[PDB]
Amino acid sequence: LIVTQTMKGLDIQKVAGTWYSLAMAASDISLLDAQSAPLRVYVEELKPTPEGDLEILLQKWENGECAQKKIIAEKTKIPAVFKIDALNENKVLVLDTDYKKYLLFCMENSAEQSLACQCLVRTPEVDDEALEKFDKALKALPMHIRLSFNPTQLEEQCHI
Amino acid sequence: LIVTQTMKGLDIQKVAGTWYSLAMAASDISLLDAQSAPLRVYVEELKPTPEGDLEILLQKWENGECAQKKIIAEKTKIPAVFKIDALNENKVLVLDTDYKKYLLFCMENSAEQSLACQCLVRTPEVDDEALEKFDKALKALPMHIRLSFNPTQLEEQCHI
Numbered sequence: 448l449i450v451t452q453t454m455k456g457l458d459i460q461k462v463a464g465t466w467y468s469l470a471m472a473a474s475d476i477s478l479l480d481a482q483s484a485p486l487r488v489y490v491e492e493l494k495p496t497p498e499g500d501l502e503i504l505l506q507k508w509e510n511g512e513c514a515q516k517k518i519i520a521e522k523t524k525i526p527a528v529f530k531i532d533a534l535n536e537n538k539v540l541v542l543d544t545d546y547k548k549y550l551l552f553c554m555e556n557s558a559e560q561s562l563a564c565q566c567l568v569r570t571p572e573v574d575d576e577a578l579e580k581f582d583k584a585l586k587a588l589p590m591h592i593r594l595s596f597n598p599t600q601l602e603e604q605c606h607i
Numbered sequence: 608l609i610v611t612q613t614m615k616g617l618d619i620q621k622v623a624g625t626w627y628s629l630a631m632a633a634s635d636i637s638l639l640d641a642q643s644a645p646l647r648v649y650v651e652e653l654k655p656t657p658e659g660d661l662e663i664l665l666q667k668w669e670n671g672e673c674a675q676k677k678i679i680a681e682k683t684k685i686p687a688v689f690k691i692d693a694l695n696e697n698k699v700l701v702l703d704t705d706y707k708k709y710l711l712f713c714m715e716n717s718a719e720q721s722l723a724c725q726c727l728v729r730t731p732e733v734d735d736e737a738l739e740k741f742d743k744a745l746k747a748l749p750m751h752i753r754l755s756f757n758p759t760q761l762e763e764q765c766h767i
């Protein structure tokens with residue numbers, strides 16, 4: 448637990464729909480520095496299942512192509528926290544969302560930390576306010592790389 | 608002129624000596640995203656000539672090696688601004704320095720902008736205060752990539 452910022456009162460049904468990865472940050476440069484860096488994932492769509500799990504549609508540059516990936520994040524007893532299947536089993540946390548304009552989330556390793564966060568917005572627009580929130584959520588965290596994307600890039604697959 | 612932050616009262620004789628590129632930022636992701644990205648330059652030493660020009664010793668990852676480069680920055684009528692030889696002739700500006708602990712500077716293209724800034728410190732240490740200054744100098748600028756380095760990396764050639 449490096450991330451001690453979770454959304455109280457979260458209803459994942461309302462995070463449904465389209466999102467744009469406006470900004471990203473990570474604890475290690477190599478997590479985000481290249482198109483094919485392991486945590487450079489661009490969120491396309493959130494699908495909350497009836498059960499309350501969270502499917503995630505994303506783009507990730509893998510073999511020189513911009514590939515479509517589907518990720519299932521399984522709900523926990525904490526409504527703001529979800530779990531993905533991997534060797535280390537990675538944790539997704541929702542820090543803050545207004546549902547209508549922005550959503551802030553981080554992904555973190557159970558063990559070693561290793562951490563990346565994103566500022567998601569609904570439309571291809573530089574939302575100053577939400578970036579402020581993201582920045583303020585960042586100061587508490589040991590980030591060493593930050594990226595942010597313009598409205599042109601936001602409309603391209605893998606933000607090209 | 609995107610950068611409208613210059614040091615008043617600057618004496619480049621006192622910027623003499625050792626510096627560490629603690630943090631960097633740029634207007635375009637591709638300027639800083641890889642070891643061999645064009646503006647990923649790590650400052651090693653500043654040498655102000657008697658005339659008042661500014662030689663710069665740096666490291667830059669070029670052909671898989673971490674190479675030593677010497678850059679001469681020629682003084683202008685503005686004491687805070689210097690000029691480097693290139694096709695576009697690049698401008699170096701000193702935004703703020705206490706001489707003893709931190710120095711903030713940017714490099715910018717005369718035409719298109721294209722811009723990178725660094726927070727330099729004297730020792731291999733995460734200076735929170737100077738990073739605050741760097742952050743505050745950044746909010747005015749359209750940066751899309753930011754990096755920062757830990758004390759271990761600061762002691763390695765090309766911050767490895």
Ligand SMILES: CCCCCCCCCCCC[N+](C)(C)C
Nearest residue numbers: 485488503518533537539552554
């Ligand atoms: C609520 C928002 C959820 C979005 C989370 C997307 C998870 C990115 C997957 C990276 C981890 C997988 N890995 C290690 C194999 C590359």
Ligand SMILES: CCCCCCCCCCCC[N+](C)(C)C
Nearest residue numbers: 645648663678693697699712714
């Ligand atoms: C006061 C501090 C001064 C440090 C400035 C160092 C200049 C970096 C050189 C990059 C431009 C050269 N280029 C385009 C060929 C890669």
